[PDB]
Amino acid sequence: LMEQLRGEALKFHKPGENYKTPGYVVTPHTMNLLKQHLEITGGQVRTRFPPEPNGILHIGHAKAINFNFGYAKANNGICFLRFDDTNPEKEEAKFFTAICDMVAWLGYTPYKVTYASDYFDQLYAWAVELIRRGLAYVCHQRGEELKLPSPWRDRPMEESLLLFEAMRKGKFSEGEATLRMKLVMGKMDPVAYRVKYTPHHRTGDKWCIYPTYDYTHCLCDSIEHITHSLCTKEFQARRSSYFWLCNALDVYCPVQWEYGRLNLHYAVVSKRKILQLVATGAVRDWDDPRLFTLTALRRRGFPPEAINNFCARVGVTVAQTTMEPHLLEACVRDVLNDTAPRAMAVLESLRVIITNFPAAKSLDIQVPNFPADEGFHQVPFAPIVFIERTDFKEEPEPGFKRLAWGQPVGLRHTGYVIELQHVVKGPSGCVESLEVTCRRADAGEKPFIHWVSQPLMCEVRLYERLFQHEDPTEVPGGFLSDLNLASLHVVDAALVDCSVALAPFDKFQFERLGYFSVDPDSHQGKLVFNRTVTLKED
């Protein structure tokens, strides 16, 4: 992928430049403030990825993460993980860590971790400067509609100065008067500094005037010296707005390039819709698989290489190809294929006892954990082994190939085959327990199924695309009714072998089944597996 972000030294502008391409602006700053830009960074093309402690980070945010932390890592720069405080938002600690966790899950160490609140002093300082330099007045109206006219424009300077000084000292009533700019762009709705009266996370108490995303996340690009600043694609009729605060205070600028809002189908990610689904009961937690939250796909298996490789395939532009799980579940099929070894396991546990086979208990035998040259792990063989009844019908249709009377079937990774003998039914008419002697098919005879012997575990959880079709919204009325085929469900029977392991985010192939990953409910005794991808089907 960094073959494709290095090719943006084959498209963009190197350390410095800045004046070359974008919405370039020339003041008594361009050649003498950019001189200081390179006199602090050294070039070092700095970017940033700035979410919120409210944030939930869904797969589409990986196009954001791969971009910033990537271009830095590609073209030898750094990148700020910058938590967007602005308006104080309580606490929510689970996502405060979810972000830091997920950032590293993909493999990037953020150069620095900063909060927006870190710079409330110089944001205020430059706010004081903005009222004096003009283009900043104290108005009201709102909430008399932020959209109705445009009053108090060219008001007296000092009046808006002492009022802004009053605004923070507590001489106001949480609503009266804001601090706007003489803004145009759009529909000229300016709000630089509002007034709250609410505690903060980082700088609690002390403060009761707090800026806004527009004002905050323009200057901080400057402040921390950024030479790219990659915005998503809600920020189109806002290109004017970003280049407006810089130069109006004269600063080393970003350039702000935009990428395409790449969502995904079959998906819902908003916490007001999810923490709903948590409480309805369709899903477990916010990290429940089939949710498409980044912290969920981790649970589901899905190697962080597989998520990044997907991005190098369909991204790095301004086109927002909101695509499908099929072409993404086909990208993780690429990785679990040879990042995770073979193992095989049974579900419809059917007691099969082998009469005539050599020696006593166990007998090791080694399994090709990988159909390569790397090496073999071992699982106990005969007697009393386990196949699933889905590989045995009493009366077979010609399409059968597994176990039938007189139709012996091979045992995976074994020089042996069982011929089928007498079968037991027990109480009613259930195929209870069958038996057979093995002919050690060195004598050449195809059906070659899987098996376990001296088995083990407990739980295997199977998951489908939660909605039977696409992003529940496009006028079906409404969103809480695509939760069809249960999806779900679990099997706490499940007999697996000694290939595992017993640790809890490892991945496997269960031979002739699916690719399976371990889940954070596992111990070393009562272990539990998610079924990640479907084994190459469709």
Partner 1 sequence: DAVLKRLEQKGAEADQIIEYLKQQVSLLKEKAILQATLREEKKLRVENAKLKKEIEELKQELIQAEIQNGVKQIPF
Partner 2 sequence: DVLVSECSARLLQQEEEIKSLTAEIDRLKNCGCLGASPNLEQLQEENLKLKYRLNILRKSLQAERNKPTKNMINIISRLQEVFGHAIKAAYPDLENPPLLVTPSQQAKFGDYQCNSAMGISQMLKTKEQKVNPREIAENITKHLPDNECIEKVEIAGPGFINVHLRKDFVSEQLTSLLVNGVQLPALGENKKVIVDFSSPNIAKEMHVGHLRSTIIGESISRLFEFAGYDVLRLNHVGDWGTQFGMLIAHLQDKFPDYLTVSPPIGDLQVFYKESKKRFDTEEEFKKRAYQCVVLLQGKNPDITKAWKLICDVSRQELNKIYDALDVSLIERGESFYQDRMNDIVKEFEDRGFVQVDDGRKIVFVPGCSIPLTIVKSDGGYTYDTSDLAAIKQRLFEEKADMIIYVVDNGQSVHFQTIFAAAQMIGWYDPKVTRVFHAGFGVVLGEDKKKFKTRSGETVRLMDLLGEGLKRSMDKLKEKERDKVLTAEELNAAQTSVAYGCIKYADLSHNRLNDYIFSFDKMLDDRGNTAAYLLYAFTRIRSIARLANIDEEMLQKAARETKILLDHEKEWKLGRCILRFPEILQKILDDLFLHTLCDYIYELATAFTEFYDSCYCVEKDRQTGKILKVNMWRMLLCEAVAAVMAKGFDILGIKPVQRM
Check the annotation: does 59 bind a ligand.
Answer: yes
**Can residue 171 be called a binding residue for partner 1 (CB under 8 A)?**
yes
Select the binding partner of residue 159 from partner 1, partner 2, none (C-beta < 5 to 8 A, by kind).
Answer: partner 1
13 is an annotated ligand-binding site residue: no
Residue 261 bears catalytic tag: yes
Q: Which of 8, 46, 48, 52 is catalytic?
A: 52
Shortest distance, position 123 Cβ to partner 2, whole Å: 18
Q: Does 170 help bind partner 1 (rule: CB under 8 A)?
A: yes
| Residue linked to tokens 């935009």 | 258
Strand boundaries in 39-175, DSSP class E = 47-49, 79-83, 112-115, 136-137
Encoded amino acid at 24, one letter: Y
Q: Which does 208 bind (CB under 5 to 8 A by kind): partner 2, partner 1, none?
A: partner 2
Q: Is 232 annotated as a binding residue?
A: yes
Would you tell me the crossing angle of helices 93-106 and 304-313 to the nearest 10 degrees? Answer: 70
DSSP 8-state assignment for residue 132: H
- Binding to partner 1 by CB under 8 A, coded x per residue (else -) over 173-202, reads ------------------------------
**Residue 296, number of CB atoms within 10 A of its CB:** 23
Residue numbers 473-492 binding partner 2 by CB under 8 A:
477-478, 480-481
138 touches, from partner 2, partner 1, none (C-beta below 5 to 8 Å by class): none
Q: Kindly report the number of other CB atoms within 10 A of residue 217's CB atom.
A: 21
- Assess 205 for contact with partner 2 (CB under 8 A): yes
Q: Of partner 1, partner 2, none, which one does residue 523 interact with (CB within 5 to 8 Å by kind)? A: none
**169 is a site residue for partner 2 (CB under 8 A):** yes
Out of 153, 206, 272, 422, the residue judged to bind partner 2 by CB under 8 A:
206
Residue with tokens 């150069």: 111
Q: How far apart are CA 235 and CA 50, in angstroms?
A: 14
In Å, how far from its chain's centre is CA 196? 33
Confirm if 178 and 65 have CB atoms less than 8 A apart.
Answer: no
Residue 159 known to bind ligand? no
CB nearer to partner 1: give 197 or 479.
197
Q: What angle do CA 65, 68, 72 make, to 5 degrees?
A: 130
Among 7, 199, 415, 520, indicate the residue that binds partner 2 (CB under 8 A).
Answer: 199
Residue 448's binding partner among partner 2, partner 1, none (Cβ under 5 to 8 angstroms by kind) is none
Give, in order, the Cα–Cα distances in Å from 456 to each of 323, 483, 525, 537: 40, 33, 9, 28
What's the longest Cα–Cα distance across the chain?
102
Q: Which of 271, 284, 402, 412 is catalytic?
A: 271
Q: After which residues is the chain broken (C to N over 2.5 A)?
A: 147, 185, 374, 447, 469, 503
Is 84 annotated to bind a ligand? Reply is yes
**Residue 162 in the binding site for partner 1 (CB under 8 A):** yes
Q: Cis link prior to 535 (omega < 30° from 0)?
A: no
What's the angle, vertex CA 324, arms to CA 318 and CA 327, rounded to 5?
Answer: 95
**Rounded to the nearest whole angstrom, what is the least distance from the CB of residue 99 to partner 1 in the complex?**
37
Locus of tokens 């979410």: 51
Task: Give the helix ranges, DSSP H, for 283-376.
Answer: 294-299, 304-313, 329-336
d(CA 153, CA 143): 17
Give min distance, CB of 160 to partner 1, in A.
Answer: 11
Q: What is the DSSP letter of 323?
A: B
- Among candidate residues 261, 333, 439, 440, the one labeled active-site is 261
Asked if residue 270 belongs to a known ligand binding site, the reply is: yes
- First-to-last C-alpha distance (Å) of the chain: 27
39 near partner 1, rule: CB under 8 A: no
Task: Provide, rounded to whole angstroms, the least separation between the CB of residue 422 and partner 2.
Answer: 35
Mark whether 271 is an active-site residue: yes
Contact 178, 193 (CB under 8 A): yes
Q: Which residues 100-159 are close enough to bind partner 1 by CB under 8 A?
A: 159
From candidates 208, 277, 282, 345, binder to partner 2 by CB under 8 A: 208
**By the 8 A CB rule, do 527 and 500 touch?**
yes
477 binds, options partner 2, partner 1, none, Cβ within 5 to 8 A by partner type: partner 2
User: At closest approach, how far in Å is the CB of 169 from partner 2?
Assistant: 4
Annotated binding site: 52-54, 58-64, 84, 213, 232, 261-262, 269-271
Per CB under 8 A, residues contacting partner 1 are: 159, 162-163, 169-171
Which residues does the annotation mark as catalytic?
52, 261, 271
Q: Which residues are annotated as a binding site for ATP?
A: 52-54, 58-64, 232, 261-262, 269-271
Task: Tell me the binding residues for L-glutamine.
Answer: 84, 213
- Binding region for partner 2 (CB under 8 A): 169-171, 174, 197-199, 205-206, 208, 477-478, 480-481
